[PDB]
Amino acid sequence: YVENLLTQLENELNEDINTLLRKCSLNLVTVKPLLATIKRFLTSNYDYLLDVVDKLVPMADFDDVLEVYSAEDLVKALRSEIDPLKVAACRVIENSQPKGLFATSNIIDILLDILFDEKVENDKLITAIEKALERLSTDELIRRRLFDNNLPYLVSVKGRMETVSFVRLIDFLTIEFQFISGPEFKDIIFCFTKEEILKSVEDILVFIELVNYYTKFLLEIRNQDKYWALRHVKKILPVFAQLFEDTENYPDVRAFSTNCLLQLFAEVSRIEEDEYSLFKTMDKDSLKIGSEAKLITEWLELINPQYLVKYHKDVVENYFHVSGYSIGMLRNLSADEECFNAIRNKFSAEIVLRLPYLEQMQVVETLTRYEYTSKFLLNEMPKVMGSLIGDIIDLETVHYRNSALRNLLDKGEEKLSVWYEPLLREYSKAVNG
Amino acid sequence: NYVENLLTQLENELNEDNLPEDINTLLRKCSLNLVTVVSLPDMDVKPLLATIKRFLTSNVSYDSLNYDYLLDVVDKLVPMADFDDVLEVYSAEDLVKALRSEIDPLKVAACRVIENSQPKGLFATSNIIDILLDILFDEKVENDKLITAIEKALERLSTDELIRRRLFDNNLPYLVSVKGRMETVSFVRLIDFLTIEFQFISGPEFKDIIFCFTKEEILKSVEDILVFIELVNYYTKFLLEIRNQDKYWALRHVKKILPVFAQLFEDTENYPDVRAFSTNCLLQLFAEVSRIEEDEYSLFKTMDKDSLKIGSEAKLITEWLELINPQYLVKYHKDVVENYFHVSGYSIGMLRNLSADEECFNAIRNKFSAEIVLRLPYLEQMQVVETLTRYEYTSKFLLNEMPKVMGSLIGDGSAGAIIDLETVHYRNSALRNLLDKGEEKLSVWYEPLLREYSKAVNG
Numbered sequence: 001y002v003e004n005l006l007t008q009l010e011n012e013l014n015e016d017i018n019t020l021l022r023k024c025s026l027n028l029v030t031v032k033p034l035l036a037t038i039k040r041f042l043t044s045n046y047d048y049l050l051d052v053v054d055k056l057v058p059m060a061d062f063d064d065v066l067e068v069y070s071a072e073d074l075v076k077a078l079r080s081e082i083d084p085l086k087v088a089a090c091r092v093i094e095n096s097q098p099k100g101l102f103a104t105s106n107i108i109d110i111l112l113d114i115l116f117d118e119k120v121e122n123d124k125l126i127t128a129i130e131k132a133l134e135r136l137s138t139d140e141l142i143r144r145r146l147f148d149n150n151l152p153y154l155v156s157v158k159g160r161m162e163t164v165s166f167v168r169l170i171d172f173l174t175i176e177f178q179f180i181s182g183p184e185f186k187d188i189i190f191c192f193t194k195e196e197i198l199k200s201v202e203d204i205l206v207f208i209e210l211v212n213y214y215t216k217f218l219l220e221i222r223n224q225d226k227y228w229a230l231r232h233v234k235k236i237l238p239v240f241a242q243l244f245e246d247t248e249n250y251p252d253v254r255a256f257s258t259n260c261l262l263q264l265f266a267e268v269s270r271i272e273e274d275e276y277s278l279f280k281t282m283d284k285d286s287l288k289i290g291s292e293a294k295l296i297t298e299w300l301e302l303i304n305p306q307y308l309v310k311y312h313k314d315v316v317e318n319y320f321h322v323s324g325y326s327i328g329m330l331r332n333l334s335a336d337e338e339c340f341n342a343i344r345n346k347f348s349a350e351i352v353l354r355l356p357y358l359e360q361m362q363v364v365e366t367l368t369r370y371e372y373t374s375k376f377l378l379n380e381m382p383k384v385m386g387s388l389i390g391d392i393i394d395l396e397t398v399h400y401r402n403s404a405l406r407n408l409l410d411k412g413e414e415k416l417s418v419w420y421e422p423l424l425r426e427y428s429k430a431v432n433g
Numbered sequence: 434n435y436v437e438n439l440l441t442q443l444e445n446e447l448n449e450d451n452l453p454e455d456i457n458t459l460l461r462k463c464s465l466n467l468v469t470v471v472s473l474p475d476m477d478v479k480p481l482l483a484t485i486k487r488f489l490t491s492n493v494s495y496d497s498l499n500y501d502y503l504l505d506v507v508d509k510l511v512p513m514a515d516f517d518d519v520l521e522v523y524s525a526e527d528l529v530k531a532l533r534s535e536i537d538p539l540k541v542a543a544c545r546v547i548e549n550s551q552p553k554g555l556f557a558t559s560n561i562i563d564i565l566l567d568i569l570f571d572e573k574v575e576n577d578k579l580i581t582a583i584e585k586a587l588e589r590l591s592t593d594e595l596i597r598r599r600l601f602d603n604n605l606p607y608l609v610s611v612k613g614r615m616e617t618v619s620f621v622r623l624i625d626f627l628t629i630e631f632q633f634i635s636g637p638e639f640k641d642i643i644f645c646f647t648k649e650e651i652l653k654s655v656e657d658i659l660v661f662i663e664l665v666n667y668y669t670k671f672l673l674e675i676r677n678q679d680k681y682w683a684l685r686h687v688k689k690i691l692p693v694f695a696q697l698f699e700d701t702e703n704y705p706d707v708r709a710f711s712t713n714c715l716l717q718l719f720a721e722v723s724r725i726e727e728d729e730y731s732l733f734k735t736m737d738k739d740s741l742k743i744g745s746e747a748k749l750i751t752e753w754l755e756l757i758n759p760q761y762l763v764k765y766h767k768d769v770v771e772n773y774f775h776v777s778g779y780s781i782g783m784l785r786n787l788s789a790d791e792e793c794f795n796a797i798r799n800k801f802s803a804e805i806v807l808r809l810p811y812l813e814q815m816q817v818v819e820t821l822t823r824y825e826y827t828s829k830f831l832l833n834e835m836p837k838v839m840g841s842l843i844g845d846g847s848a849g850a851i852i853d854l855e856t857v858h859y860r861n862s863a864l865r866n867l868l869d870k871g872e873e874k875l876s877v878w879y880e881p882l883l884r885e886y887s888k889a890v891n892g
Contacts, residue, residue, distance in 0.1 A: 001658075022575060026617065030659045121461065140852055167465070181852050182892065204435065208469055225861065225890045256435070259470060393594050395633065402679070433636040433682030 002027050009052070010034045013041055021048035028055035035060075035068040042085040043077075047124075053088050062097035071105050078110045083122050086114065090128035093136070100141035108133075108145045109153070115172065116157045118164035126168065130175065137179045146176070147186060154189055161199060166206055170213045177220055182228045190217075191232055194239045201243065204256045211240060211260040218267035230271065234278055237268050241286035262295075266302035276307050283311065290315040301328040305339035316342045322351050324359040330366050337372045344376060349383035357392075361400035364388050368407035378419065389422045402430050436466050437475035443506070444481045447488070452497045460502035467509035478514045482507075482522040489539040490531075500538045507542050516551035525559050532564045537576050540568070544582035547590070554595035562587075562599040563607070569626065570611045570619040580622065584629065591633045600630070601640060608643050615653060620660055624667045631674055636682045644671075645686055648693045655697065658706045665694060665714040672721035681726045688732055691722050695740035716749075720756035730761050737765065744769040755782040759793035770796045776805050778813040784820050791826045798830060803837035811841075811851075815859035818842050822866035832878065843881045849892050861889050 009024050010033055025048065038053060057065055069077075069092045077089035093111070096102055114120060115129045136142040147154070157169050173190055180190075192200075192210060200207040214233070221229050243253045244261050253261070265287060269279050283289055289299045289312050296319055300308065308316055320329055320343045333339050352363055364384060367373040377384060388405070392398050405427040413420045443463050446453050453459075472478065485507055488498070511519055523531075523546045531543035547565070550556055568574060569583050590596040601608070611623050627644055634644075646654075646664060654661040668687070675683050697707045698715050707715070719741060723733050737743055743753045743766050750773055754762065762770055774783055774797045787793050806817055818838060821827040831838060842863055851857050864886040872879045 018575065026621070027659060030621075030662045138854055140854075163465075179854055181854070181857060183850060183852060205466060205469070225865075227890045228892055393635070395592050398635075406679075431679040431681050 006031075006034050010037050013037050018045045018048055021045065021052060025051045025055060028052070028059065031056065031060045032064050032068055035065065039068055039073075039088070042082065042088050043080075046084045050084055050087055050091075054091050057091050057095050062095065065092055065095065071102060071107065074102070074107055075105070075110060078107070078114065083125055087125055087128045090125070090132045094128075094132035096136060099136050099139035103139070103141035103145045108142065109150055112146075112150055112153060115168055116153075116165040118162055130171065133172070134175050137176060143176075143179060143184060147180075147184065147189060151186070151189065158189065158196075161196070161203075161206060163203060163206060167209055170209050174213065174216055177217065178224065182226075185229065185232065187232055192236060194236060197236060197239050197243075201250055201253065204252050207253070208257050208260050211257055211264050214240070215260065215264045215267050218264075218270070222267075222270060230273075234271070237264075237278060238282050238286070240264055241268075241282040245286035245288075262298050262302055266304075269302075269304035269307050272304075272306075276304075276310070279304075279307060280311065297326075297329060301332050303332075305333050305336035308333070309336060309339035309342050313342055320346060322346050322355075322363070324355060324362075327359065327362050327366075330363065334366050334370065334373050337370070340370070340373060340376075347376070347381065349381045352381065352384045353387060357387075358394060358397045358400070360384070360387055361397050361404060365400040365404040365407070368404045371411075374408065374411060378417075385419055389419075389426055398430070402427070405430065434473070434475070437473045439463055439466055440478070440481055441476075444484055447481075447484045452495060456497060457499045457502055460499065460506055464502065464505045464509060467506070467513065470513075472510075472513045477518055478510065479518050479522055482510065482514075482519065486522055486527075486542070489536065489542050490534075492536070504538055504541055504545075508545050511545045512549050516549060519546055519549065525556060525561065528556070528561055529559070529564065532561070532568065537579055541579055541582045544579070544586045548582075548586035550590060553590050553593035557593070557595035557599045562596065563604055566600075566604055566607060569622055572616055572618040584622075584625065587626065588629045591630060597630075597633060597638060601638065601643065605640070605643065612643060612650075615650070615657070615660055617657060617659055621663055624663050628667065628670055628674075631671065632678070636680075639683065639686065641686055646690065648690060651690060651693050651697075655704055655707065658710045661707070662711050662714050665711055665718050668694070669714065669718045669721050672718075672725060676721075676724065684725055684727070688725070688727070691732060692736050692740070694718055695736040699740040699742075716752050716756055720758075723756075723758035723761050730758075730764070733758075733761060734765060751780075751783060755786050757786075759787050759790035762787070763790060763793035763796050767796055774800055776800055776809075776817070778809060778816075781813065781816050781820070784817065788820050788824065788827055791824070794824070794827055794830075801830070801835065803835045806835065806838045807841055812853060812856045812859070814838070814841055815856055815863060819859040819863040819866070822863040825870075828867065828870060832875075839878055843878075843885055848885065849888055857889070861886070864889065 005020075005024055005027060009020060012020065014037060035053075035056065038049060041049065069089070074089050074092060077085045080086065090111075093102060093107060102108065111129050111133065115126065115133075120126060133146070137146070154169070157165055160166070177190065197207075197210065200210050214237075217229075217233060221227060221233075240261060243250050244258075244265075247254050265279075265282070268282065269276070271278055287299075289303065289308075290296065296315065299312075300316070300319065316333060316339060320326060320333060322330070330343075333343050352360055355363065364377070364387075367377045388401070392401070405423055408416065408419065408423050409427055416423060439459075440463065443459055446456055446459055485503060488495070488503060494500075523543070528543050528546060531539045534540065544565075547556060547561060556562065565583050565587065569580065569587075574580060587596075587600075591600070608623075611619055614620065631644065651661075651664065654664050668691075671683075671687060675681060675687075694715060697704050698712075698719075701708045719733075719736070722736065723730070725732070727733075741753075743757065743762075744750065750769065753766075754770070754773065770787065770793060774780060774787060776784070784797075787797050806814055809817065818831070818841075821831045842860070848860065851860070864882055867875065867878070867882050868886055875882060
C-alpha cells in the first residue's frame with residue numbers, strides 16, 4: 001500500500017496534490033525514481049513536498065539517496081537561489097552515512113556561509129542547517145571540518161558581532177560544545193575576551209545573548225563534568241560582575257540584563273575551587289550580596305547556600321522567615337547543612353501548620369530531600385508529619401505530597417520508625433487508588 | 434526603554450495610511466528582542482494587540498505584510514502581558530468569532546490567547562473548548578500550526594479541573610463519536626490529545642469509554658494498519674506513563690486488552706499486515722507489558738505461552754533479549770539466555786538488558802573472560818565495562834574475576850588524548866560508577882580510578 005501511494009505521487013508530479021502529499025507523509029511517519037522526480041521539481045505546497053523528502057530520506061539506504069543527490073548536486077543545490085531545494089539538500093546532508101562522508105568536501109563550508117548570512121530570513125532553512133550540523137557533529141572528521149578547515153571563517157563571524165549572524169553563532173557554539181573534547185577545544189572560537197564583552201554592551205541584545213551563553217556553558221561544564229574547560233572561562237567572569245556593579249558607566253547592564261546576570265552568578269557560585277576564590281572576589285568587589293535590598297530574595301534563592309552561610313550568615317539568619325513567599329529561598333538554603341542550621345530556628349510545627357496545604361506540601365517536600373532536614377522534620381515537627389499523613393484535586397499539591405511521601409520512603413523502614421507503615425499506606429493509596 | 438520603543442515604532446508603522454517598506458523587517462526585529470523575557474511597564478500593550486487584531490479580523494489580506502511575522506509578535510507578546518489587558522482586546526465572544534471564522538492566522542492568535550488564560554479555568558464555562566475540539570477533529574484542516582496551537586492551548590489549560598470537566602464531561606459524547614470514527618487524520622490527533630490529557634487525569638476522573646479501547650475496536654483498527662500502529666504506540670506510551678507518573682491504579686483499566694495485541698502478533702495467516710508492518714511497535718509494547726506492576730508476571734507469561742513464544746522464532750531472539758524484562762527472561766527462558774548470548778560489539782544491546790537482573794546476569798556470567806573482552810576495540814570494551822559498572826553484582830564480577838579488564842579501563846596513560854565522543858562518555862561513566870561504590874569496596878583500584886577520573890574531568 002505505501003509503495004503504491006508513492007508510485008501514484010511519482011506519476012502525479014510528472015488539483016488535490018496537497019492531500020496526497022499529506023497522505024504520503026502520514027503513512028511514512030507511522031525509492032530512487034520518486035526522490036529524482038521530487039529533485040527535478042525542486043531544481044525547476046512545497047512544505048508538503050519537503051515533508052515527504054524529510055521522512056523518505058532517513059528510511060532509505062543512503063547509497064540510493066547519494067545516486068539522486070551527489071556531493072556535486074548538493075553543492076549546486078546550496079549555491080542556488082531556491083530555498084526549498086536548499087532545505088532538501090540539508091535533509092540529505094543530515095542523514096549522511098557514514099556521518100563523515102562529506103567531511104572532505106566544501107559542503108560544510110557552504111552550510112556555514114548560509115548560516116551566517118544575516119540576509120537569510122528563512123527560519124526553516126536556518127533550522128535545517130543547524131539540525132544537519134548537530135546530527136553530523138558526533139563525528140570527529142565533521143568537527144575537524146568545522147573547527148579546523150573553517151576556523152578563520154568562524155573567528156571572522158565572531159569578530160564581526162553583527163546581531164543576526166552573532167545570535168546564530170552563539171546557538172551554534174552551544175550545540176557544538178556538547179561534542180567537543182579537551183584536545184579539540186579552541187579558546188579563539190568558544191571564549192570571549194574582556195574587549196569583546198565590553199564591545200557587546202553597545203547592543204544590549206548581543207550582551208544578553210553572551211551572558212546566557214556563559215550561563216549554559218558553566219551549566220554544561222557541571223552536567224558533562226568538563227572541568228578542564230573552567231580555566232578557559234574563569235578569567236572573564238569578574239568582567240560580567242564589574243558591569244553589573246557599574247551602573248554609572250554602563251546603566252543598560254542593570255537596566256536590561258539583571259535577570260540573566262543573576263542566573264550567571266548562580267552558576268559562578270557553584271565553582272567551589274580554592275575556597276570560592278573567584279566568587280568571593282566578585283561578591284566583595286562587585287555583587288556585594290546584602291547591600292541592595294531588592295536583590296536579597298534572589299541572591300538567597302540562587303547563590304550556592306554553602307557560600308551564603310560562610311560569607312553572609314548574618315543575611316541568612318536575619319532575612320529568612322517561613323511563609324509561602326520564602327519557599328524559593330527555603331529550597332536553596334536547605335541544600336547545605338550548615339546553611340540549613342542558620343534557618344532551623346525559624347521553623348516550628350505551628351508556623352508550618354498555619355500555611356495552606358499546597359504551601360505545607362512544598363515546605364515538607366523540601367525538608368524530605370535531605371538527611372539533616374528529614375531528621376529535623378521527624379524529631380522536631382512530628383505534628384507536621386501528622387499533617388502530611390492527614391485524615392485532593394490540585395495537581396501541584398498532589399505532586400509535592402507524593403514526592404514528600406516517596407523521598408521519606410527512600411530512607412527505609414529503619415530510619416522511619418513509627419512513620420513507616422502510615423507513609424507506606426498513604427503512598428499506596430496515592431499511586432494505587 | 435528600547436523594547437517598548439521598538440513596540441511603539443511597530444504600533445505607529447502599522448497605523449500609517451499605507452504600511453511602510455520596512456514593516457516585515459521591523460516585525461522580525463521585534464520578535465528577536467521579545468525572545469529574551471518579561472515586558473517593561475511603560476504602557477498597556479493594548480493598542481498594539483488591538484492594531485494587530487484589526488489586521489487579523491480583516492477579510493482583506495495585505496500583500497506588503499507577512500502574517501507569520503505578525504503572529505510571531507502575538508505569540509511572544511501575549512504570555513509577557515497581564516491577561517486582563519489581553520482580555521480587553523480579545524473577549525470570550527471575540528474568541529468564539531475568531532474560531533468560527535475562515536481566517537487561519539486569526540484562529541492561531543485566538544489559540545495563543547486561550548492558551549495563556551489566567552485563571553486557567555476562565556473559559557471553562559463557555560463553548561470555547563467545544564469549538565477548539567470541532568477544529569481539532571476536522572479531517573479537512575491541513576494547517577499544522579493551527580493543530581499544534583490548539584494542542585498547546587489544551588495542554589497548558591488541562592492542569593485546571595474545570596477545563597478537564599469541560600473536556601471530559603461537557604464534550605464526552607463528541608469525543609467518543611470521534612473515537613468511534615477511527616478516521617486516520619482525526620484519530621491520530623485524538624491519540625495525541627489522549628496522551629497529553631492522561632498526564633493530568635486523576636483516578637476519580639478516569640473514563641474507560643474515552644481512554645481505553647475494547648477488543649472489538651482493536652480488531653476494527655487492523656483494517657487500516659496506520660490506525661493500528663497508532664493504537665499500539667498509544668498503549669506503549671500509556672504503560673510508560675503509568676511507570677513514569679506512578680499511576681498504577683490505571684493498570685486494571687488497560688490490562689484486559691493487552692493479550693489481544695499478542696494474539697494479533699501471532700496470527701500471521703489471518704492478520705498478515707500486523708507482522709508485516711507493525712512488528713517493531715508491538716515489540717516495544719511487549720517490552721512495557723513485561724514490566725507492569727503485576728503479580729509474578731501473570732499476564733505476560735500467558736501472552737508469551739499462547740502467542741509470543743519467546744525463543745521459537747530465531748530472527749526475534751536478539752530483540753526479545755534486548756527488550757523483555759530480564760528477570761522474566763531468566764525465570765521462563767533460562768535456556769535461551771544461556772545458549773544465545775555471547776560477548777561482542779553486536780550483543781551490547783542484549784548485555785545492557787540481561788545485566789539488569791542478578792539472576793539473569795548469573796546465566797550469562799560464564800560467557801565472559803578477560804581475554805574475550807580485551808579483544809574488543811576500546812569503544813566496545815568501554816561500553817561493556819560501563820554496563821558491568823552499573824550494578825553491585827556485575828562490578829564485583831568485574832573486580833574479582835576480570836582484573837585484567839580493570840587494567841584496560843585504567844590504561845597506559847594515553848586516555849587524555851581520546852577524542853571519540855562515545856569512548857570518553859562510556860569510560861568516564863565507568864570510572865564514576867566504580868568510584869560511587871566507595872574506597873572500601875574498591876580496595877587497590879581506588880587510587881588508580883581516582884587518578885584516572887581526575888585526569889579525565891580536570892585535564
